[PDB]
Amino acid sequence: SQPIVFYDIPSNDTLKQSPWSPNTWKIRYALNIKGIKYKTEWVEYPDIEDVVKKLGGKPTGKKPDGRDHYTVPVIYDPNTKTVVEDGIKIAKYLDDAYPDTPRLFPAGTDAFQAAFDDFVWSVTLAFPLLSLLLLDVSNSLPPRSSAYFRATREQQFGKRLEEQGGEERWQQLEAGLGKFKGYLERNGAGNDLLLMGTQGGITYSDVQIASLFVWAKVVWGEGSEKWKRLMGFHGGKWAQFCAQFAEYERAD
Amino acid sequence: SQPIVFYDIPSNDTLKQSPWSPNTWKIRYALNIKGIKYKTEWVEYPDIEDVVKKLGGKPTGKKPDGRDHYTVPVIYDPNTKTVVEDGIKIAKYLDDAYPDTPRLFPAGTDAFQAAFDDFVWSVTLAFPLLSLLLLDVSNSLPPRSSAYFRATREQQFGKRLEEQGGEERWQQLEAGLGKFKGYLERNGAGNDLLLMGTQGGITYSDVQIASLFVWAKVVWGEGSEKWKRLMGFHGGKWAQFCAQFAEYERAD
C-alpha cells in the first residue's frame, strides 16, 4: 500500500523548514495518530491554486470576490485514486477509508464535532491567536510565500501586519482558552484533557486545538517568551494538554 | 418517592397560562422525557431573586453591575434534599441522581454538549429568535412580570421592545438554523434529526433546540403567521425535528 501525498506549506531556514500551519497540522496529526504512510509535497502559498487545480482538487469555499478559494491541507490517496480537500473532510475520509486506524470521529460525535469546529475558528479563540502570529508567520515563510502572505492578509484585515496583535488579544485568547477549559471540566476531574474524556480517546476536535498550539510552538519557538507565556495560561493545563500529542509530531 | 419542585415563570390568559420560557422548557422536557414526577411552582420575574434566595439556591452568574444574577429554571429535589440551579447542571443532575431514566448526557458527550451550548445561545441562533419574540413575550406575561421584563430587557439592549426584530433577524435566524441543519447532515441521511443520529437517542443538546421552538410555538401560537413561517424554513425540516418532541409536552 502506497504513501498518501500530503500537501503542506513550507517554512524558511529560521524554522528549519518545519511544517507550521495550524490547518495542515491537523491532518499531519491525523496521519501520525493513525499511522498511515504519507509523504509531504511542499507547495508555496501563491502556487496553491494551480497545484490543486492541476491535481483535480475542489476549492473549499469562495473569496469575497466570489472567486474560487483553493486551500490546503489537501491529499491524494493513490490507494483509492481520490483527492480530498478540506481538513474536516480529509480527517473523516481517513476514518472511512482506513477503518482499523484509530477513529477520529467516534459514532454519533459527527455533528457535535462540526459544531465544535465553528467554536475553534472564531473570534473567540483561533482569531485572537492568529493576530498574535500573523507577523511572525510572514517572517517564517520562503520569500515568495511571505510576499503573498503579507499582501493577502493585510488586505484581508485592513491593517498592516505590524498593527496586529497586542494585549487586547492575549486577553481574548486566554478567555477563549478558558471557555475550552470550561467545557473540558464538564467531563469531570481526571477526564478534563480530552473532549471525550482522557478515557474515551483522541478526536479530531481535540486535534484541532493541539494544532493551534503546535503552530504557536513552531513559529514562536519552544524557547520563546510568547510560547512560555501561553503555556503559562490556566496553571499550565495546556502544557498537560499538548503533552498528549507529543509522540505525534513527525515533520516530513 | 416525592415530586420534584420545579420553578417556572407564568403567562397570562392570552397563552392560557401555558409555560413558555425556552430556558425552563428544556428542563420540563427533561423531566417529561425521563418520566420523573414533578409539580410546577410558578414564580413572577421580579420575585425570582427572593424565591431562589429564601430557597437556598445559588445565582447562575453576575449582572454587569457585578450584582448577583439569580435565574430560573431551578429545582428542589425532596428525595435528595438538594437545590439545583442552572439548566445544563439541572439536566446532568437529573442524569446522575436518576440513572434508570434516559441519559441526556451519553458517555463522553459531556464536553461536546457544553460546546454546543455556546452555539445555541449566541448571536448565531438564539438571539435572532429572541429579537423576534421580545415584544410578544412582554405581552404574554402577568402584569407585574411583564413590567419587569420590559424594563430590564429594554435597558439590556438599549432599544424599546417595539424597535426589536424585523427581517434582518429572520435572515440571521434562518442562517443559524441552516448551520444546525448542516451539522445534523454530517450524521448522514436517516440520522439528520438528532445530534447523535435518529438512532442513538435524544440528548440535552437536542432538547435545547426543541425548547427554542416550543417557546416560539407557545408565544406566537401554533396557528400564527410567524410560527408557520418558521416551520416553513428548510423545507419543513424543523417540523420533522419538532415532532420528535411532541409526546413530551406536558404543561403543569
Residue numbers in the entry:
A (entry chain A), B (entry chain B): 2 to 253
Paper text:
Most of the GSTs are dimeric proteins, each monomer harbouring two domains : a thioredoxin N-terminal domain containing the conserved GSH binding site (G site) and a more variable C-terminal α-helical domain (H site) usually involved in the binding of the GSH acceptor compound. As assumed in our recent report PcGSTFuA2, PcGSTFuA3 and PcGSTFuA1 share the same structure, which contains distinctive features when compared with canonical GST structure: (i) a new mode of dimerization, (ii) an original β-hairpin (β2’β2’’) that inhibits the formation of the regular GST dimer and acts as a lid over the G-site and (iii) a supplementary helix (α4’), between helices α4 and α5, that closes the presumed H-site.
PcGSTFuA2 crystallized in the space group C2221 with three dimers in the asymmetric unit. Global NCS restraints were imposed during refinement because diffraction limit of the crystals was 3.2 Å. The observed holo conformations can be explained by the presence of crystallization agent molecules in the G sites, which mimic some of the interactions formed by bound GSH. The citrate ion stabilization involves the main chains of Tyr-71 and Val-73 and the side-chains of Tyr-46, His-70 and Arg-154. The largest is localized in the center of the helix α4 where a residue is inserted in PcGSTFuA2 sequence.
